[PDB]
């Protein structure tokens, strides 16, 4: 990490490893493993100087290559330089002890896909979620995407699995947490691991990426949200989706999805990038849906 010592640039400023805030290892205590390993080897932790700071701790297995090490460092740099409420904060790092740690804002609600799946309405918990909850999650992530767009950062992998919630209950805030794809790109894995079902046509055809490619992905995220955590294009394979979407195919509305919300999805999925909304427009249309009583009084389906 010191032998290659990569620099990272965001918003015109250049940073290096030496700019990360090193937290002494003795101040860090691991409490428990977290989640099913979506975001990697992640633990709930405590940082103290009492009233200790609660954190997520991402670890780097010591049995990783020197390039995994570099990926890890770059991931830390990227997330440390963001400054927005809908992007997970980086508390600091602990790189001078092994295994290496990145310290992250603790998102007690877990990842958005799992949350949607586990908090689906069911006969026992009839009103676990409401349409307004979903629109608020959508707004939250759109707000983070707008921040990235304004700072000319293309995320390349906007998807529910890469978003997290602060807490499970009312008052939850959704945030973008994973930046691995953008990391891999900034440092450039294989064809079968690409997020095909979240990618626009010109991503395949020409490999051209812009903020309008995040707009497309956000449309798919909206479908994930309002379907309550379903896999996009259910029962289609990656190559089937690639051929479907290229030929103009689009997903049907999620069950009970209000028309005004589905129309945001279809606008996000315009074949021509220039016909897709930027995230300021997406935010406007989400807000409009939020104001519409017929939208927010639509009942979600029961599982
Ligand atoms: C690498 C990385 C990790 C994180 C991160 C992860 C967490 N949190 C959890 O992984 C978690 C999982 C599962 C639960 C448990 N469930 C139980 C019931 N659920 C309905 C909700 C939460 C809680 C937290 N906070 N921050 C953020 C950014 C980055 N780059």
What CATH number corresponds to the domain at position 159? 1.10.510.10
Sheet (strand 42-47) strand order: 28-33, 42-47, 53-60, 100-105, 90-94
**Of all helices (H) and strands (E), which one includes residue 94?**
strand 90-94
The structure's method of determination equals: X-ray
Among 106, 141, 165, the domain-final residue is 106
Answer yes or no: is 298 within a domain: no
Same-domain status, 116 and 20: no
Q: What are phi and psi of 58, to 5 degrees?
A: -90, 130
Mutational pocket test of ligand 1: of 74, 99, 108, 115, the residue with most ligand atoms within 8 Å of the beta carbon? 108
Instruction: For residues 233 and 262, state if they share a domain.
Output: yes
Helix (H) or strand (E) holding 289: helix 279-291
What contacts 24+ positions apart, CB below 8 Å, involve 127-133? Answer: 129/228, 129/300, 130/296, 130/300, 131/258, 131/295, 131/296, 131/297, 131/298, 131/299, 131/300, 132/290, 132/296, 133/170, 133/172
Residues 83 and 167 in one domain: no
Say if CB 177 and CB 89 are below 8 A apart: no
Atom of ligand 1 nearest to the CA of 40: 1
The residue out of 106, 141, 158 marking a domain boundary is 106
* Residue span of the structural domain in which 9 resides: 1-106
99, 200: one domain:
no
Q: Are residues 92 and 123 in the same domain?
A: no
Q: Binding site annotation covers 135? A: no
Please tell me whether residue 286 adopts helix, strand or coil conformation. helix
DSSP annotation of 127: T
Cα 108 to averaged position of ligand 1 atoms, centre (Å) = 6
Q: Are residues 142 and 82 in the same domain?
A: no
**Complete DSSP assignment for 150-214:** HTT---S---GGGEEES-SSTT--EEE---HHHHHHHT---GGGS-GGG--HHHHHT----HHHH
Does 240 share its domain with 157? Answer: yes
| Burial label, 99 (beta-carbon count in 10 A; 0-12, 13-18, 19+) | middle
Pick from 235, 257, 253, 255: nearest CA to 244: 235
Beta strand pairing status for 163-165 and 13-16? Answer: unpaired
Query: Are 98 and 177 found together in one domain?
Result: no
Cβ neighbors of 274 (< 8 A, separation 6 or more) are 212
How far apart CA 76 and CA 51 sit, in angstroms, is 25
Whether residues 64 and 144 share a domain: the answer is no
Per-residue CA distances from 222 to 41, 85, 124, 160, 179 (Å): 28, 20, 26, 9, 19
Nearest-5° Cα angle at 234, 228 to 239: 135
**Per-residue buried b or exposed e for 190-206, using 16+ beta carbons within 10 Å of the residue's own CB:** eeeebbbbbbbbbbeee
Ligand 1: atom nearest CA of 39 is 1
**Of 26, 25, 55, residue with least CA distance to 43:** 55
| Structural domain contains residue 300 | no
Q: Which residues are catalytic?
A: 157
Residue 303 domain flag: no
Atom 28 (ligand 1): residue with closest C-alpha? 177
Is 71 in the same domain as 114? no
Question: Omega of the bond prior to 296 within 30 degrees of 0, cis?
Answer: no
Q: What are phi and psi of 197, to 5 degrees?
A: -70, -5
DSSP 238: H
The conformation of residue 22, written as its DSSP 8-state character, comes to: B
Instruction: Please give the resolution of this entry in Å, rounded to 1 decimal.
Output: 1.9
Q: Is there a single domain that holds both residue 162 and residue 194?
A: yes
Instruction: Say if residue 45 is in the same domain as residue 140.
Output: no
Give the domain-ending residue among 106, 128, 157: 106
DSSP 8-state code for residue 84: -
Distance CA 136, CA 114 (A): 17
Sign, Cα dihedral of 71, 77, 80, 82:
negative
Count of other CB atoms within 10 angstroms of residue 34: 21
> Which residue in 2, 127, 129, 121 sits closest to 73, CA to CA?
2
In total, how many domains does the chain have?
2
CATH number at residue 69: 3.30.200.20
* Cα-to-centroid distance, 115 and ligand 1 (Å): 10
In eight-state DSSP terms, residue 87 is B
Residue 212, marked binder: no
Query: Could you give the CA distance from residue 217 to residue 246 in angstroms, rounded to a whole number?
Result: 15
Is residue 296 assigned to a domain?
A: no
């Amino acid at each position: 990490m010191t032998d290659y010592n990569p620099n990272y640039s965001f918003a015109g400023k250049t940073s290096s490893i030496s700019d990360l805030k090193e937290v002494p290892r003795k101040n860090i205590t691991l409490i428990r493993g977290l989640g099913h390993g979506a975001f990697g080897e992640v633990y709930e932790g405590q940082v103290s100087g009492p009233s200790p700071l609660q954190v997520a701790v991402k670890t780097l297995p010591e049995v990783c290559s020197e390039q995994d090490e570099l990926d890890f460092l770059m991931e830390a740099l990227i997330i440390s330089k963001f400054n927005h409420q809908n992007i997970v904060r980086c508390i600091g790092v602990s790189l001078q002890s092994l295994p290496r740690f990145i310290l992250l804002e603790l998102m007690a609600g877990g990842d958005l896909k799992s949350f949607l799946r586990e908090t689906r309405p069911r006969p026992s918990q009839p009103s676990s979620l409401a349409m307004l909850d979903l629109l608020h999650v959508a707004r939250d992530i759109a707000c983070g995407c707008q921040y990235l767009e304004e700072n000319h950062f293309i995320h390349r992998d906007i998807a529910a699995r890469n978003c997290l919630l602060t807490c499970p209950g009312p008052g939850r805030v959704a945030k973008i947490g994973d930046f691995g794809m953008a990391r891999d790109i900034y440092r450039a894995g294989g064809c079968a691991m690409l997020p095909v079902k979240w990618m626009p046509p010109e991503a395949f055809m020409e490999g051209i990426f812009t903020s309008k490619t995040d707009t497309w992905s956000f449309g798919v995220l909206l479908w994930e949200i309002f379907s309550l955590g379903y896999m996009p294009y259910p029962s289609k394979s990656n190559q089937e989706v690639l051929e479907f979407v290229t030929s103009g195919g689009r997903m049907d509305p999620p069950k009970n999805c209000p028309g005004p919300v589905y129309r945001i999805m279809t606008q996000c999925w315009q074949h021509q990038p220039e016909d897709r909304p930027n995230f300021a427009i997406i935010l406007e249309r989400i807000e409009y849906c939020t104001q519409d009583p017929d939208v927010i009084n639509t009942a979600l389906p029961i599982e």
